[PDB]
Structures are given as structure tokens and as C-alpha cells.
């Protein structure tokens with residue numbers, strides 16, 4: 332009925348977090364989603380994803396009940412330069428098991444252009460593509476990079492962000508709270524999302540974090556995750 | 568289309584804030600909702616309310632649109648003693664114009680027993696009455712002191728709390744974020760509320776803060792508001 336996991340820090344070679352592409356783990360006990368320099372020389376078009384080994388069940392076929400979950404994590408985004416404009420963003424996401432990876436850059440390594448991929452994600456977009464509003468912003472992506480609801484927030488460069496994503500099965504209310512404590516700012520964005528109806532092909536989904544850097548040179552930024560807890564609660 | 572007000576501090580004798588009962592304004596530029604001692608001797612059964620002079624419009628009869636508002640405020644609750652247990656709580660609330668005052672203590676000076684008063688309020692209950700869950704908790708009161716949704720939170724004694732109450736007319740999603748920055752804690756509670764259906768007798772409502780202390784000696788705490796901004800935005 333309940334699935335949980337908590338990372339107060341990130342230990343190297345954990346049998347719990349399954350890393351992909353540029354994503355590695357710093358000796359610091361930090362999860363680094365995208366490299367800023369590989370082999371001494373600066374790079375771009377970097378993409379890093381990190382999933383949780385076990386599939387989380389979001390709804391029951393027999394019972395017909397949808398899970399309620401809450402996940403929290405701290406991240407640190409540093410944007411070194413002012414020109415060219417930094418990119419692309421960081422994002423929490425849920426996809427069905429054994430599902431293709433998303434494109435780089437703008438799609439945050441989660442979504443693909445042809446309407447094929449089935450995914451959900453809460454994004455922290457730092458770059459304004461053709462479909463984006465002023466950046467940076469918080470976005471609720473339901474099967475598309477185009478957020479169904481967004482919120483502009485002022486990023487604290489190199490500061491520690493505290494995120495909370497809470498979803499209540501009964502009210503189908505997805506909520507996102509972004510707060511920068513070291514400065515006293517809080518951002519809250521919430522919209523209605525019908526999980527059962529949006530992931531009808533798998534009662535199970537993989538949960539993970541992802542980030543990506545620009546397509547040009549220097550259109551990059553750091554994407555570090557400091558901690559990350561999760562917990563679903565499926566009744567019935 | 569838009570009504571706003573902001574108090575980065577509280578000036579004495581402002582023509583924008585109709586104070587009621589025990590509620591006064593300290594010289595430090597703080598709004599003190601309930602006195603802990605009057606003239607030198609300790610007291611209880613204290614009740615303080617503070618409204619905003621102008622009525623805020625929440626919905627339009629003709630167009631049919633409901634307003635969307637967001638209000639933030641910082642408060643400081645200090646509970647001096649451990650026995651007897653402290654009471655009662657602090658709360659943001661909306662009532663129709665020219666409406667009666669609620670009862671002391673448990674009703675937070677907002678609601679009355681006989682189902683007569685029409686009101687809404689986000690409460691920060693510090694005392695567990697017969698209808699309450701473990702305290703302290705955040706509660707969403709829709710026409711009753713019995714919250715339709717609640718959330719237990721650990722209070723930081725004498726610390727500054729940052730509250731955010733955001734309501735989105737289109738999704739009818741009421742959200743409450745309570746965060747104690749000095750410690751790194753965030754609490755988020757959200758439930759669905761149909762403002763237009765819950766205040767059908769007045770397109771207008773008075774907005775205000777309120778607090779109350781126990782019914783017994785020493786079952787008291789301080790209720791200070793440091794800042795408080797609001798903003799509705801009714802389309803059409």
C-alpha cells in the first residue's frame with residue numbers, strides 16, 4: 332500500500348538510484364545531473380537523468396483507486412555567464428516502465444516531438460523556447476513540454492532551492508511549492524491532474540529527476556540535486 | 568478588475584484597517600491580535616480581529632465570474648508555558664459585510680455554534696477541541712470550524728512564519744503554504760473550494776485576520792502579525 336525512499340545525501344554506486352547519460356554522483360554526496368566540463372574542456376548539449384530502481388504504482392486496475400504521493404528535493408542551479416542566455420532546465424518526471432528517453436535541451440530529456448511519449452513532469456524551465464512564457468518558470472507538463480500551468484519565479488543563482496510536489500488522489504490536485512529559504516521567497520503553483528486518465532497504459536511508472544544544458548556554447552548551467560525523498564500512498 | 572493592499576509594517580491609526588476588540592498595534596510596527604496581559608496583570612479569553620476597510624469583490628452577478636486572489640502574511644506565535652496546554656489559534660477569514668462576530672476561544676472569533684454565520688477561513692489551530700485532529704494544524708474552514716481539510720505542522724515557538732494562501736477561480740483550487748524559513752520547513756495543504764457557491768448572499772466580503780487565547784488561566788499565547796499583503800483579480 333505504501334512505497335517510500337529517502338536520500339539525505341547521495342552515496343556512490345547505490346543499488347537504488349539508476350543513473351543515465353551525463354548524470355553522475357560527486358564525491359560531495361551530491362547528484363550532478365549535467366556536466367559543465369568533461370575532461371577539462373567546457374561542453375554543452377548535456378543531458379542527465381536519474382531514476383529510482385523500483386517502479387512506483389500509481390493506480391489499481393482491480394480496485395480502481397489512484398495513488399497520492401508527495402516528493403521533496405533540494406537543487407542548486409548556477410548560471411555562470413550572462414551571454415549567451417543559459418539553458419535549459421531541470422525537471423521531476425514520471426514515465427511508464429521501459430519507455431524511450433526524451434530529446435535534449437528544450438525537452439529536458441523527457442519529451443520527444445512526435446506525439447509518441449507518454450509522460451508527466453514538473454519542470455523548472457530556465458530557457459524560453461518558442462512554446463515558453465518568460466523564464467525561469469515552474470511548469471506542470473502533462474504529456475507535453477507545453478505546460479498546462481506555469482509560474483514565473485526569480486532564481487537565486489547558486490542558491491539552494493527546496494521543492495515540494497504534492498498530489499492528492501481524491502481532489503486530483505497537483506501542487507508545487509518552490510522555496511528559497513536563504514532569501515525568504517516562496518512560490519506555489521497548483522493545477523488539476525487526473526493521473527489515472529493520463530497514464531492509462533501502465534498502473535506503474537518510473538520516477539526520476541532530469542536536467543539538460545544548451546545547444547549552443549556557454550548556454551549552460553549546473554544542475555545539482557542535494558537531497559530527494561518520495562512517498563506514494565495507494566489506498567484500497 | 569483588481570484590488571490590492573500591502574502592509575510591510577503596521578502604522579498606528581491607519582485608515583485602512585478597522586481593528587476590533589483586544590486587537591491593537593504595538594509601537595514596533597506590529598499588529599498584536601490578542602493581549603497576553605492587560606495593564607500589568609495576566610489575562611485569557613482574549614479575542615482580536617483586524618479587517619481591511621474596503622470590501623473585496625469575490626464574484627460578479629452579471630458576468631458570472633469568480634475572483635482569484637492571493638494573500639501573504641508573516642505571523643509570530645510564542646507559547647510561554649507547557650501546562651496548562653496553550654490555545655487557541657490564529658486565522659485568516661472572509662465574511663460578508665455587516666456580519667456578526669464569532670465566539671471567543673475555539674471558534675477563533677469567527678464562527679458561532681448555531682449554523683447561522685456564513686464564513687470562510689484558513690486556520691492555524693493550536694488547540695485540540697472535540698472536533699479537532701492533533702495540533703497544531705492548518706485547516707481550511709468552509710462555513711464551519713470543522714475544517715474540510717487539515718494538516719499537522721510543527722510550530723516553531725517564537726519564530727517567524729510565512730504564510731501564502733492562493734486561490735485560482737478557474738480550477739477552484741485553494742492552496743495554503745506555511746513555511747518557517749529560519750528552520751527550513753515547508754507545509755502545503757490544498758483543497759477544492761467553490762467561492763461563488765459558498766458566499767451566495769454577497770458578491771462582496773470583508774477580509775481579515777483573527778486570533779484568540781484560551782478559556783482557562785495560562786492557556787494563552789501571543790498572536791502577532793508582522794506583515795500582510797492581499798490581491799484579488801476578477802476578470803470580465
Ligand SMILES: *[C@@H]1O[C@H](CO)[C@@H](O[C@@H]2O[C@H](CO)[C@@H](O)[C@H](O)[C@H]2NC(C)=O)[C@H](O)[C@H]1NC(C)=O
Nearest residue numbers: 359367407408409411488489490491553554555
Ligand atoms: C552550487 O553549484 C555550484 C556549481 O557546482 C557550486 O560551485 C562550485 O563549488 C566547487 C566547490 O565545491 C568548485 O570546485 C567549483 O569550481 C564551483 N563551480 C562554480 C561554477 O563556481 C556551489 O558550491 C554550489 N552551492 C552550494 C551551496 O552547494
Ligand SMILES: *[C@@H]1O[C@H](CO)[C@@H](O[C@@H]2O[C@H](CO)[C@@H](O)[C@H](O)[C@H]2NC(C)=O)[C@H](O)[C@H]1NC(C)=O
Nearest residue numbers: 603642643644645647724725726727728789791
Ligand atoms: C515574537 O514576539 C514575541 C513577543 O514580542 C518575541 O518574544 C520576545 O522576545 C524579546 C527578545 O527580542 C524578549 O525581550 C521578550 O521578553 C519576548 N516576549 C515574550 C512574551 O516572550 C519573539 O522574539 C518574536 N519572534 C520573532 C521571531 O521575532
Ligand SMILES: CO[C@H]1O[C@H](CO)[C@H](O)[C@H](O)[C@H]1O
Nearest residue numbers: 418419436437545546547550
Ligand atoms: C534556439 O534554441 C536552442 O538553443 C538554446 C540555447 O541557446 C536552447 O538549448 C534551446 O533548447 C534550443 O532549442
Ligand SMILES: CO[C@H]1O[C@H](CO)[C@H](O)[C@H](O)[C@H]1O
Nearest residue numbers: 654655672673781782783786
Ligand atoms: C476545554 O476547552 C476550552 O478550554 C481550552 C483551554 O484549556 C480552550 O480555550 C478551548 O477553546 C475551550 O473550549
Ligand SMILES: [Ca+2]
Nearest residue numbers: 456458460463
Ligand atoms: Ca524551455
Ligand SMILES: [Ca+2]
Nearest residue numbers: 692694695696
Ligand atoms: Ca481548536
Ligand SMILES: [Mn+2]
Nearest residue numbers: 456463470478
Ligand atoms: Mn516551460
Ligand SMILES: [Mn+2]
Nearest residue numbers: 692699706714
Ligand atoms: Mn482545527
